[PDB]
Each structure stands twice: as structure tokens, then as C-alpha cells.
Structure 1
Amino acid sequence: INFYKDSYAASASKQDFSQDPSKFTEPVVE
């Protein structure tokens, strides 16, 4: 919980489960 006026003040955001490993494992075009 955040009672500060700046949004950077908040706790860490451990909620981003989006992965795109294919930009490193398949960076090929065909």
C-alpha cells in the first residue's frame, strides 16, 4: 500500500508474467 503522491514510490511490481522468449530463441524470419 502506497500513501505517497509519486507513483515511483510504490512497492515493486512483481506481476508481469508476459514472456516473449522467441525474440531470443527464434529471431529468424522464415
Structure 2
Amino acid sequence: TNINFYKDAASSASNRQELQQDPGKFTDPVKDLMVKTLPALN
């Protein structure tokens, strides 16, 4: 499966196995860390 039969990188398979995520980009985008337990404002 990992073997690539074509020299072109665009010819490789879909990177289905690659599970990466950074929800902090969109779900925690604030500059200052907002802890769930701590009050968010003041």
C-alpha cells in the first residue's frame, strides 16, 4: 500500500491514514490561553 509505483508525487495514493488535527486553530484561537476551569473574562 505504501509502495509508490509512479515517480510523480501527485500520482501517489490519498493520505487517508494521516490523521492530524489542530482544533486550537479554530476552536481555541485566542491569543491568551483560556482555561476551561478558569473564568474566561476577568
- Whether these two folds match at TM > 0.5 is yes
Show structure 1 runs of 5+ residues with no match: none
1 CA distance for matches of 2:18 and 2:5? 23
Higher relative contact order (CA 8 A, sep 6+): 1
Matched residue type, 2:20: S
Identity %, equivalent residues: 50
- Higher helix residue share: 1
- Higher strand residue share: 1
* Superposed structure 1 runs of 4+ greater than 3 Å apart: none
Matches within 5 A, 1:1-30: 1-30=3-32
**CA-based RMSD:** 1.5
Tell which structure's C-alpha radius of gyration is larger. Answer: 2
